[PDB]
Amino acid sequence: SLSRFVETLVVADDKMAAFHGAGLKRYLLTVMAAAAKAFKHPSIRNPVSLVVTRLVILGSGEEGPQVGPSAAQTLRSFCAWQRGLNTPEDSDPDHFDTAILFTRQDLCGVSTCDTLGMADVGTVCDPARSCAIVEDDGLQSAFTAAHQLGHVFNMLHDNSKPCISLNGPLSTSRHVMAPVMAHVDPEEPWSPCSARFITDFLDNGYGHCLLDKPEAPLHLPVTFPGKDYDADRQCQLTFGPDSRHCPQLPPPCAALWCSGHHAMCQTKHSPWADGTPCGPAQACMGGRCL
């Protein structure tokens, strides 16, 4: 089976910078790594290799895309912007196959949105339309990412009419292309339905532009995200610099609860990052302490 490469542009926005500071590039790489690990899983049934060839960080001095107010607007804004950066032929190292915008603007509290982001379906090799938006809110934005790129590869939600047929009645929502905020089974990240829709896409020659290998991609961390950022840090990434992990809430791994201000524990209900210590000889995998 012919091996694919997705030459990804990554764009961090004006507010993503304020939030992450110097820690940004590393953060963004840690997330992208994590998305890339999902596309590399045998469950997708295709040798797809997610790869960052460019990374751009804006100001505040750098006239970027007009992000906000909505998610639908942000995507049309981004996709028109991102083109001024691309090149005519996939022969120039600067040519990228798809683009992703991470923003820390609350779009999904003012506007409708897919998970915490948006994308069109089946666009991988259309430079005018191959692009995505993700609202960042922690390491788990690596799955928001994959879900949106999934759509880029012509995937649909696992609760659509076509997907019920293929996944079977006893299907769970523990996969990347589930319409809810996901808790992806890492033994089986992609469902049968997602596995098929991509196969058909690539087989019908829609991934013709993913065949060239980029000469110099950015290095992606090979350590777990829970080792790179501990529980407190992960909490800090979701909610703010003052947020500490509330470990006391059972079961370990299933939900990252973080402190806030009397005093409280809050949650976005997305698991602890994979490889967070949760026991003496234990770390978390897919929201469980194994």
Distance CA 94, CA 84 (A): 12
Please, which residue, 187 or 212, has the CB nearer to Ca ion? 212
Residue 95 contact partner, candidates Zn ion, Ca ion, none, CB within 5 to 8 A by sort of partner = Ca ion
CB of 272 to Zn ion, least distance (A): 23
Q: Mapping DSSP to helix (H, G, I), strand (E, B) and coil, where does residue 148 land?
A: helix
Q: How many beta carbons lie within 10 A of that of residue 129, not counting itself?
A: 18
Choose, by CB under 5 A, the member of 94, 200, 203, 212 that binds Ca ion: 212
Q: State the alpha helices, DSSP H only, in the chain.
A: 14-20, 24-39, 71-81, 141-152, 161-167, 192-203, 225-228, 231-239
Choose, by CB under 5 A, the member of 114, 136, 185, 228 that binds Zn ion: 114
Displacement of CA 52 from its chain's centroid (Å)? 13
CB of 167 to Zn ion, least distance (A): 15
Residue 203 contact partner, candidates Ca ion, Zn ion, none, CB within 5 to 8 A by sort of partner = none
Token digits of residue 181: 């905020």
Please, which residue, 32 or 209, has the CB nearer to Ca ion? 209
Rounded to the nearest 10°, the torsion over CA 38, 10, 178, 229 is 60
Distance CA 137, CA 202 (A): 31
C-beta separation of 100 from 9 below 8 A: yes
> DSSP strand E in 71-222: where?
98-103, 117-119, 131-135
Q: Which stretch binds Ca ion (CB under 5 A): 2-10, 23-31, 115-123, 134-142?
A: 2-10
Considering only residues 5 to 44 of the shown chain, the ones binding Ca ion according to CB under 5 A are 7
Of the candidates 125, 179, 171, the one whose C-alpha atom is nearest the C-alpha of residue 147 is 179
Token digits of residue 257: 């609860």
Choose, by CB under 5 A, the member of 209, 246, 258, 278 that binds Ca ion: 209
CB of 161 to Zn ion, least distance (A): 15
* Residue 158 found at the interface with Zn ion (CB under 5 A): no
Q: Which stretch binds Zn ion (CB under 5 A): 30-38, 111-119, 135-143, 244-252?
A: 111-119
CB of 163 to Zn ion, least distance (A): 12
CB of 118 to Zn ion, least distance (A): 8
Residue 114 contact partner, candidates Ca ion, Zn ion, none, CB within 5 to 8 A by sort of partner = Zn ion
Q: Is the peptide bond before 65 cis (omega within 30 degrees of 0)?
A: no
Residue 209 contact partner, candidates Zn ion, Ca ion, none, CB within 5 to 8 A by sort of partner = Ca ion
Residue 135 contact partner, candidates Zn ion, Ca ion, none, CB within 5 to 8 A by sort of partner = none
Distance CA 41, CA 189 (A): 7
Q: Mapping DSSP to helix (H, G, I), strand (E, B) and coil, where does residue 136 land?
A: coil
Q: How many beta carbons lie within 10 A of that of residue 281, not counting itself?
A: 5
CB of 30 to Zn ion, least distance (A): 23
Considering only residues 72 to 101 of the shown chain, the ones binding Ca ion according to CB under 5 A are 90, 95, 97
Interface residues with Zn ion (CB under 5 A) are 114
Interface residues with Ca ion (CB under 5 A) are 7, 90, 95, 97, 209, 212
